[PDB]
Design a protein around this ligand. Structure first.
Ligand SMILES: CC[C@H](C)[C@H](NC(=O)[C@@]1(C)CCCN1C)C(=O)N(C)[C@H](C[C@@H](OC(C)=O)c1nc(C(=O)N[C@@H](Cc2ccc(N)cc2)C[C@H](C)C(=O)O)cs1)C(C)C
Ligand SMILES: Nc1nc2c(ncn2[C@@H]2O[C@H](COP(=O)(O)OP(=O)(O)O)[C@@H](O)[C@H]2O)c(=O)[nH]1
Ligand SMILES: [Ca+2]
Ligand SMILES: [Mg+2]
Ligand SMILES: [Mg+2]
Lengths: 427, 67
């Protein structure tokens, strides 16, 4: 445990993956060239978790950029920070995955996958002690969906002893109009259940509704949604990047958050919710907000379920007494929403460095049984098409069988049944 | 898993090949049934006409039979 290898696949993966490096680069005082220009040495104490230090004391992100089309990666290379990334670490195709999981996993992705793994291997070599892997991707497309999950499976074969963690973007009919998305998403969940240690369920429905109802953006863009995603990614990784006691590594996080191996889908939360365009928040406000439904990055009502485990990260200069007071107040005021059979399931961290333009923030990470709502949604949409076998030719024309679909459908339905099991479980 | 991945791409290839094959076969079959049919139609037409010529000789011979 020390170094994290980051992989970003497909359009969504590369867009959110790019925004991630831009945000934490500024946080750790690294300019678009890779040169350090910060005020604190707290910025470099754990820099090697995400960055490789190179000759002439220049910091290179330990990032692999994957896609089955050049498009997005070209705009990432043309972008502000595209210069920070190692150019040998840009692995792309020309075909595209055409929003088809079968193309990303079996046909087109199959052709590119070993070139990615050679870059994964090279990065893994330059590691004194590799922790595991981080992947950004959407579950609704073809590349990040199909290729991303095949890359996880292949990485797991070569590194079975390491931690596999993902930032998976869930589809919403409010953001996308690609009919096949529920199919790709169910095929991807089946993979995530088996092969990941931790998954941050980033839901496009919740990101859209936050932008519309709370940020009062009439016509939200992808960059608006990605702004909330980059804030969430910066917050959920804090403990890994800065000196600290709680969840300072991927494994310690998993042991605190995962009571049952399939139940590793986290509902991230964030306070204050902001749009890209003064008024500081009190420790009590940060606490009410981070636990509020309106601040969740997954379109689930936490009050409809029970928390199995919670991680709370507070960023900035505040009272550790008051943080502790408010955290205990939240648990003691709503004790029914926290399983009694997992004693002291809420663990809190406080980090002195806040994000850009915020005096203070709070990031929540919850393993709530209410995540079954997101899975019931994708399941409702999948079953509606699959019971009439609609749009399957796109998949069977790639060599897949109805069996894979029936299996994926079953595993996700079983996962929803498991989350219910522990919601109705008493001590 | 690596086995099933291999099996799936192989099934994609065989179904595509079987498709090009069946198409090639259907066309060869149709262009031969049509060639034989059109030829048989012209043949039938010209025998009917050749028998009209045969009959005309029978008429010219029946005329010369009186002289
Ligand atoms: C006329 C159709 C519009 C474009 C589309 N409408 C729909 O999909 C609707 C609402 C119509 C029918 C039902 N359906 C769900 C739409 O609003 N969306 C698909 C948006 C996304 C769309 O919004 C607009 C207003 O353009 C896009 N946003 C960007 C964008 O943010 N571009 C940024 C760069 C980028 C490009 C692609 C990716 N994947 C990520 C980022 C650049 C801009 C300046 C920024 O930073 O916001 C591009 S298209 C999502 C969030 C609901
Ligand atoms: N939040 C967010 N969603 C995105 C973005 N790009 C694509 N998506 C979503 O991802 C899905 C399509 O997957 P995409 O990443 O474009 O395809 P891929 O390139 O084949 O992996 C749909 O649900 C889109 O709404 C992005 O930048 N941000
Ligand atoms: Ca090809
Ligand atoms: Mg695309
Ligand atoms: Mg609430």
């Amino acid at each position: 445990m020390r170094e994290i290898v980051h992989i970003q696949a497909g359009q969504c993966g590369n867009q959110i993956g790019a925004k991630f490096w831009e945000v934490i680069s500024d946080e750790h005082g690294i300019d678009p060239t890779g040169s350090y220009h910060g005020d604190s040495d707290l910025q470099l104490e754990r820099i090697n978790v995400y960055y490789n230090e190179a000759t002439g004391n220049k910091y290179v992100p330990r990032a692999i950029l994957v896609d089955l089309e050049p498009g997005t990666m070209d705009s990432v290379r043309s972008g502000p920070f595209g210069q920070i990334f190692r150019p040998d670490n840009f692995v792309f195709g020309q075909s595209g995955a055409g929003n088809n999981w079968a193309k990303g996993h079996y046909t087109e992705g199959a052709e590119l996958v070993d070139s990615v793994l050679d870059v994964v291997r090279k990065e893994s070599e330059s590691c004194d002690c590799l922790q595991g892997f981080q992947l950004t991707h959407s579950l609704g497309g073809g590349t990040g969906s199909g290729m991303g999950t095949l890359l996880i499976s292949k990485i797991r074969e070569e590194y079975p002893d390491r931690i596999m963690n993902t930032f998976s973007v869930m589809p919403s009919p409010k953001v996308s109009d690609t009919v096949v998305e529920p199919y790709n998403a169910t095929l991807s969940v089946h993979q995530l259940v088996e092969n990941t240690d931790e998954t941050y369920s980033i839901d496009n429905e919740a990101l859209y509704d936050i932008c519309f109802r709370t940020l009062k953006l009439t016509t939200p863009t992808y960059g608006d949604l990605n702004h909330l995603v980059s804030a969430t990614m910066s917050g959920v990784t804090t403990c890994l990047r800065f000196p600290g006691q709680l969840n300072a590594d991927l494994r310690k996080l998993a042991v605190n958050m995962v009571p049952f191996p399939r139940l590793h889908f986290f509902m991230p939360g964030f306070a204050p919710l902001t749009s890209r365009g003064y008024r500081a928040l009190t420790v009590p406000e940060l606490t009410q907000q981070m636990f509020d439904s309106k601040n969740m990055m997954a379109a689930c009502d936490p009050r409809h379920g029970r928390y199995l485990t919670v991680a709370a990260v507070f960023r900035g200069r505040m009272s550790m007494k008051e943080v502790d007071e408010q955290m205990l107040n939240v648990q003691n005021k709503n004790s029914s929403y926290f399983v009694e059979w997992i004693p002291n399931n809420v663990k809190t961290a406080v980090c002195d460095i806040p994000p850009r333009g915020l005096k203070m923030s709070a990031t929540f990470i919850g393993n709530s049984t209410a995540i079954q709502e997101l899975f019931k949604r994708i399941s409702e949409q999948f079953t509606a098409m699959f019971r009439r076998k609609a749009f399957l030719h796109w998949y069977t024309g790639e060599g897949m069988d109805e069996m894979e679909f029936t299996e994926a459908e079953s595993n996700m339905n079983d996962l929803v049944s498991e989350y219910q099991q522990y919601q109705d479980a008493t001590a | 898993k690596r086995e099933h991945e291999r099996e799936v791409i192989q099934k994609a290839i065989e179904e595509n090949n079987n498709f090009i094959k069946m198409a090639k076969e259907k066309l060869a079959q149709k262009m031969e049934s049509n060639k034989e049919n059109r030829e048989a139609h012209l043949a039938a037409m010209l025998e009917r006409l050749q028998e009209k010529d045969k009959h005309a000789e029978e008429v010219r011979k029946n005329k010369e039979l009186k002289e």
